[PDB]
Amino acid sequence: PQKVQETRKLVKTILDQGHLSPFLDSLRPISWDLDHTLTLCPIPSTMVLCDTTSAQFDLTYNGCKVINPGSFIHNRRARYMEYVPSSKKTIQEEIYI
Amino acid sequence: TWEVLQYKDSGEPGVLEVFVTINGKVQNITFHIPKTIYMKFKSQTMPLLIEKSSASLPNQLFKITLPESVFLEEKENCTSIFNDENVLGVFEGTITPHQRAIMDLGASVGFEMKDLSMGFSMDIGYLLHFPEFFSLFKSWGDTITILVINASSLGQIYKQMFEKKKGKIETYSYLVDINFEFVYFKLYRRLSQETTKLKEERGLQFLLLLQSPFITKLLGTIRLLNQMPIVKLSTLLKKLVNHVLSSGSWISHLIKLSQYSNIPICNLRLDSMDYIIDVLYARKLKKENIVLWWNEKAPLPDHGGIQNDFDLNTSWIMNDSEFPKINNSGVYDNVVLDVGVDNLTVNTILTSAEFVHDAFSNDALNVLRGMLKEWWDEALKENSTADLLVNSLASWVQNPNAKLFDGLLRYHVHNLTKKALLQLVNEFSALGSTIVYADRNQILIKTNKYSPENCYAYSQYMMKAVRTNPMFSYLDLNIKRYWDLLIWMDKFNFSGLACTAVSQWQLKKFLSPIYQPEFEDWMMIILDSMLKTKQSYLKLNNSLNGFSHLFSKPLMKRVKKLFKNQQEFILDPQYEADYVIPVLPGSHLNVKNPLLELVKSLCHVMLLSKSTILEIRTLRKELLKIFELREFAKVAEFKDPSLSLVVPDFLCEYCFFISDIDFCKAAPESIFSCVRCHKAFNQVLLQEHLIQKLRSDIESYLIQDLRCSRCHKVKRDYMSAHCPCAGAWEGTLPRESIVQKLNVFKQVAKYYGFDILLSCIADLTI
Ligand SMILES: [Zn+2]
Ligand SMILES: [Zn+2]
């Protein structure tokens, strides 16, 4: 499916690239001192990679579990995500409104 | 139906509720409207209403048209043409349905929009709230309700103001007519009770006037029954009674605005002429077939998705504003004309006239020019609304809340304004004069003439000779002062004789208190000596030659005495308070000898006299001898004690005046209030503008280009350790300057008590 393919493309790009902002500073400026915080070099155990313009997902890649909770209010539904650290499950949740 | 009073969107997508007028009555009605959209591709696709098209973009295009229901039920719900498939991006998709209707239907218009196409005399109601004091009134009732002396003061204040405004009320009595009773109040349930009782007394055929600048507007719509047609508007009870009796004139002004602009009465705001300008410009742009960059959700111009991204051109465009203002310091024995200027923005927009990638679209600029010519002609015919529009254009080209705001437009207008100010200076100098000073609001001009009574003819000749050039046809050139003799270093530090002596010096403010009177006294002596010498030279017939000799020896005697007194008393608790050097905004530097600071200031003022430098220089030597200071010692050199902190293009909305204001070199009255009118500025607004400047400079530091430290080439690559000419890379904005900027910000914040700016400065470090 298109949504799966594009979200796999997203997280695989970010984690292979190892760094949350692969773009040139001319396209996304970085405070030069604090670029070390955008780097991921010992890849995090989980990542809440919140993105307003892609489907909700909870992929795993290289043992890194990457969850996007997406937009809070979408398609007349409020949306939020319950990450369980002691099992690394990810129960999505919603309310109609 | 064939006339409109309000549009508003229904809950369901794509549908408006509308309030229309025919056969005397107001009627509620409902329109179904499509969402027009544009899309762009670099390949063809047409699976599906969709149409290939052509129209200028903002700096393969298909028009698309759906009911908003199916658009919504597809765009974020189904794999469709709205997802991927080489879409370079939607353009007009942000325009709300009623904001589309207002453009294409106007007031001079379920029911399908496909078949719709292009004397008020009714009741009014009123609800203005002054936070506890929700205040209610009807144009067809006899008592006013106020939520939680009162009756007595109300009755007599009504009688007084009614007497003050008899003719003003009477000439609009038929719009809104007068004595009445009153009542003064969980309690918020009364508001629903009152509004429902109003609805039961008038289901339709009455119009509701909502609120005033202490707004609570959205919460007001929660307490109010949302279904009314509403004109939205944004012991001190005199204010309230004045608003009540103002109502009829407001309705007259709103009817005039609607009848002119072709906009319904409920939808336009008196509070922002920029919105009227937005809808009218949008009309002409679409009628000349330009893809419209209207943005509903954000200030930025909707170019599709691309406006979300940072861009170095865009950030330069947004951050940059400062005029290359000219300041030729000196003494001027010529008469100097204080030329005021206005309409420079309007004049340049009128007189104006990819390979260039931050120029605003030439088509849209042509539409703005022709439309401004239209407005200007109607202002010449005294359409008061058209004149109010043209006067307000300077706000709209800068206001980010304008629906058609574009950073490229603001910048295109700004640098055209810059170029034209330089051309105006070129014209004045081409007429043989010479410019002392120039900025976007003012020019000071050396005349090559010696007496104002000789020049009142020549000055008006000169000004007319400028305005008769087509480049400056619309400027408000105004000879605001005549200077007989002028001493000038900047527009916060000057003195002169006008046609009578005035003196203002930010220099004075940094001297210690005992020496501030001394400075003013010697400034008057210097002016008197220069005057005596000017007229002496003119009786014998650069005229200043020898003026120091009329006071130099008294000055040295005085300064010897003051130096003795300082040695006696600077340590003394009896007198030390008057020797304390003041702390001030932009207080540049430390000083150890305040008499030396006074002498430095006086010598610097006198050293502005380009003709006479040698006599002042010798006097400066013989003065500095008093301290055993050498003539060129760095302790004795004059450096300006004020560090400028200028906020560019600050707007006084009360008179549409665009001023750069300097929080350090300006006097405090000129900061906290305007200097054309004298209305005060809101403090939080002012702190917000300083924070915008602070963050602009932090960003401008972080996004800077690096430059090679010896060949000055720009660093064109991302990972070189040094330039190929062996030189190290250095910043184009060196860190020291930015630390200095933050230092003046902390000083200004501490002094003026700017709590929000101080919290911002604190949150940078901590
Ligand atoms: Zn003003
Ligand atoms: Zn180099």
UniProtKB/Swiss-Prot annotation, chain A:
Per UniProt, subcellular location reads as: Cytoplasm; Nucleus
Per the record, residues carrying Phosphoserine are: S21
Q: Which domain of life is it from?
A: Eukaryota
Q: How is it modified post-translationally?
A: Phosphorylated in a cell cycle dependent manner during late G1 phase. Phosphorylation may facilitate the interaction with POL2 or the activity of DNA polymerase II. Phosphorylation is independent of DNA replication but dependent upon CDC28 in vivo.
As a miscellaneous remark, the entry gives:
Present with 3110 +/- 251 molecules/cell in log phase SD medium.
Which family, according to UniProt?
A: Belongs to the DNA polymerase epsilon subunit B family.
What does the record note on quaternary structure? DNA polymerase epsilon is a heterotetramer consisting of POL2, DPB2, DPB3 and DPB4.
This molecule's function is given as:
As accessory component of the DNA polymerase epsilon complex participates in chromosomal DNA replication. It is required during synthesis of the leading and lagging DNA strands at the replication fork and binds at/or near replication origins and moves along DNA with the replication fork. It has 3'-5' proofreading exonuclease activity that correct errors arising during DNA replication. It is also involved in DNA synthesis during DNA repair.
The protein in question is named DNA polymerase epsilon subunit B
Which organism is this entry from?
A: Saccharomyces cerevisiae (strain ATCC 204508 / S288c)
Coverage of the whole protein, first to last residue? 593 to 689 of 689
From Swiss-Prot, chain B:
Residues reported in the UniProt entry to bind Zn(2+): C652, C655, C674, C677
**Zn finger regions (CysA-type) covering which residues?**
652-677
Q: Name one GO cellular component term.
A: replication fork
Q: Which UniProt keywords apply?
A: 4Fe-4S, DNA replication, DNA-binding, DNA-directed DNA polymerase, Hydrolase, Iron, Iron-sulfur, Metal-binding, Nucleotidyltransferase, Nucleus, Transferase, Zinc, Zinc-finger
Q: What Gene Ontology terms for biological process does this UniProt record contain?
A: base-excision repair; base-excision repair, gap-filling; DNA replication proofreading; DNA-templated DNA replication; double-strand break repair; double-strand break repair via nonhomologous end joining; error-prone translesion synthesis; gene conversion
Provide the gene name from the record. POL2
Q: GO MF terms on file?
A: 4 iron, 4 sulfur cluster binding; DNA binding; DNA-directed DNA polymerase activity; double-stranded DNA binding; mRNA binding; nucleotide binding; single-stranded DNA 3'-5' DNA exonuclease activity; single-stranded DNA binding
Residues that, per the record, bind [4Fe-4S] cluster = C708, C711, C723, C725
Q: Which family does it belong to?
A: Belongs to the DNA polymerase type-B family.
Domain remark text = The DNA polymerase activity domain resides in the N-terminal half of the protein, while the C-terminus is necessary for complexing subunits B and C.
Principal location? nucleus
Placed within the complete protein, the shown segment runs: 1321 to 2222 of 2222
Q: Where is this motif: CysB motif?
A: 708-725
**Official protein name in the record:** DNA polymerase epsilon catalytic subunit A
Known function: Catalytic component of the DNA polymerase epsilon complex which participates in chromosomal DNA replication. Required during synthesis of the leading DNA strands at the replication fork, binds at/or near replication origins and moves along DNA with the replication fork. Has 3'-5' proofreading exonuclease activity that corrects errors arising during DNA replication.
Ranked from the top, the taxonomy reads: Eukaryota, Fungi, Dikarya, Ascomycota, Saccharomycotina
Remaining remarks: In eukaryotes there are five DNA polymerases: alpha, beta, gamma, delta, and epsilon which are responsible for different reactions of DNA synthesis. Present with 1970 molecules/cell in log phase SD medium.
